[PDB]
Amino acid sequence: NQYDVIIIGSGIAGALTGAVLAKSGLNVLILDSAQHPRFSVGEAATPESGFLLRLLSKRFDIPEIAYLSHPDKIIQHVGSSACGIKLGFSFAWHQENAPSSPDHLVAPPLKVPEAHLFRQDIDYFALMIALKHGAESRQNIKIESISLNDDGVEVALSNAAPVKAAFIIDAAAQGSPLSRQLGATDTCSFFTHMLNVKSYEDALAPLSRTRSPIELFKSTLHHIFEEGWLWVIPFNNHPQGTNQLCSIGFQFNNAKYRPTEAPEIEFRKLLKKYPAIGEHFKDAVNAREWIYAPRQNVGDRFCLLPQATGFIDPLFSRGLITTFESILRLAPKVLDAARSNRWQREQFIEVERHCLNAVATNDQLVSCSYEAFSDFHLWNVWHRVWLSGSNLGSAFLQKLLHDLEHSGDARQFDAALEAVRFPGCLSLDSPAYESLFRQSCQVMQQAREQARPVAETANALHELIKEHEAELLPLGYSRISNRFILK
Numbered sequence: 001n002q003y004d005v006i007i008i009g010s011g012i013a014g015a016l017t018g019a020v021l022a023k024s025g026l027n028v029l030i031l032d033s034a035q036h037p038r039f040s041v042g043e044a045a046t047p048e049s050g051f052l053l054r055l056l057s058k059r060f061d062i063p064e065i066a067y068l069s070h071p072d073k074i075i076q077h078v079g080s081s082a083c084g085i086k087l088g089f090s091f092a093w094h095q096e097n098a099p100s101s102p103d104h105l106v107a108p109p110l111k112v113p114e115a116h117l118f119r120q121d122i123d124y125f126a127l128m129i130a131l132k133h134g135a136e137s138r139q140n141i142k143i144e145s146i147s148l149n150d151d152g153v154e155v156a157l158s159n160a161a162p163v164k165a166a167f168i169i170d171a172a173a174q175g176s177p178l179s180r181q182l183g184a185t186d187t188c189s190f191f192t193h194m195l196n197v198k199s200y201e202d203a204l205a206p207l208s209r210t211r212s213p214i215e216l217f218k219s220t221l222h223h224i225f226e227e228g229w230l231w232v233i234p235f236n237n238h239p240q241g242t243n244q245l246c247s248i249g250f251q252f253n254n255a256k257y258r259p260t261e262a263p264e265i266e267f268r269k270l271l272k273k274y275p276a277i278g279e280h281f282k283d284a285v286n287a288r289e290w291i292y293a294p295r296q297n298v299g300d301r302f303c304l305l306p307q308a309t310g311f312i313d314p315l316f317s318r319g320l321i322t323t324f325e326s327i328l329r330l331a332p333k334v335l336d337a338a339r340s341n342r343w344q345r346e347q348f349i350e351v352e353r354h355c356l357n358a359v360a361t362n363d364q365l366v367s368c369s370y371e372a373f374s375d376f377h378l379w380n381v382w383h384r385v386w387l388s389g390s391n392l393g394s395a396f397l398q399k400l401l402h403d404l405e406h407s408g409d410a411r412q413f414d415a416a417l418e419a420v421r422f423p424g425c426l427s428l429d430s431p432a433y434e435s436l437f438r439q440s441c442q443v444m445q446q447a448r449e450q451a452r453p454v455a456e457t458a459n460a461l462h463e464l465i466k467e468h469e470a471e472l473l474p475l476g477y478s479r480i481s482n483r484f485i486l487k
């Protein structure tokens, strides 16, 4: 074993894993089939993902990692083109064969601003953190074969000698050789970057019409409709930022619409179908090619990170959340394993538990969200389930960050994160919310099998929220006429 850990994928997940382990005294090899700079999706930061980056930073004493959580610090330390601003999520609802209304809009603002991550700069910066702490990085390499045994891992590489390690981590997308070589809602997505995409305010309805507390231009804008959704994620939405691009992607429920032609053709069809969405793109041009994307965890000496186990639908940006929490749970255990020379699956079981629940939680959340797209009033009532969970979890992560900062006790932090009752779930540690979430699923799931009217199901969810309101944070989730829930 020449290295302690081999890492597959040199994107942000693979880079942060590399940095924390290198910092802690492990000899790390990062392996990637591509090279920096390069494009990557997964751009919308969230309150949770912001806290998790600060937890990793504080837990492993790497200040640079925390810069990636604050948009002002990304501008200052990564670069002026590295991000746009996010003051919240927003969801604007549409319908085929009907004019779109500026009243069919929900947008919960954040207390503190988050980033829209321009991943080519953010990821390269993250790799540079890893490189500065002693991680070794090899780019443009082809992994032929991977051999696992009692004493370690051996990875064979095209036109190079094999490389040995005590442990191997898959931090790449699904379908890497480690996934290949070891033994609910159908979707496909299209995405790209564009120049001259108009703002929601200039293109659709100004701020005086929507009465939104935030500009949707300064938000992660999700346009929703019965068969799927389209995202508009600007990088050009803040004075300090020099980036000219908007990230644009759209995704279909293949049970309701199966795309059949090339990406640019499918984009135009969708704009014809929803002319309100089309008002963004009158003078817009593609800045790169459209990507089409159609469609266990651990062992003694390997570990798949969440993104390698399966597709995490980005409707609520839980990819990054689950990715970063996984690294935070796994890293201390990999250190203990390397320091004590014990490499047994049983050591990494809670990383698997978090992962399974996280992706199931996201699957359920997204599956039942695709039904809610059927009608705005139903969507409006449904999103409060997500939001109340997401708010509870964020508060827990903040509480963990605060205790970690005041005490400085790393061992105490790892135990407290391990001891949460519902790891991977939206709330992390609230039994009453998780009850609400499972009952809300059962109302949505039996609403579409046995086809119920959208009014009665919207009412049933509304009654569930009222029943559980006292256990949620005092934000007035039950007030349905209020479409912009303040913190």
Ligand code: EMC
Pocket (backbone or CB within 6 Å): 357, 360, 361, 364, 422, 424, 425, 426, 434, 437
């Ligand atoms: C699978 C919902 Hg914690």
Ligand SMILES: [Ca+2]
Pocket (backbone or CB within 6 Å): 003, 004, 026, 027
């Ligand atoms: Ca070593």
Ligand SMILES: [Hg+2]
Pocket (backbone or CB within 6 Å): 071, 072, 074, 075, 082, 083, 084, 085, 115, 116, 238, 241
């Ligand atoms: Hg920014």
Ligand SMILES: [Hg+2]
Pocket (backbone or CB within 6 Å): 187, 188, 254, 258, 259, 294
């Ligand atoms: Hg498809």
Ligand SMILES: [Hg+2]
Pocket (backbone or CB within 6 Å): 194, 195, 196, 197, 198, 234, 235, 236, 244, 245, 246
């Ligand atoms: Hg733009």
Ligand SMILES: [Hg+2]
Pocket (backbone or CB within 6 Å): 297, 298, 302, 303, 304, 305, 351, 352
């Ligand atoms: Hg894992």
Ligand SMILES: [Hg+2]
Pocket (backbone or CB within 6 Å): 297, 306, 309, 355, 356, 359
């Ligand atoms: Hg998983």
Ligand SMILES: [Hg+2]
Pocket (backbone or CB within 6 Å): 364, 365, 367, 368, 369, 437, 440, 441, 442, 444
């Ligand atoms: Hg659900």
Ligand SMILES: [Hg+2]
Pocket (backbone or CB within 6 Å): 364, 438, 441, 442
């Ligand atoms: Hg369920």
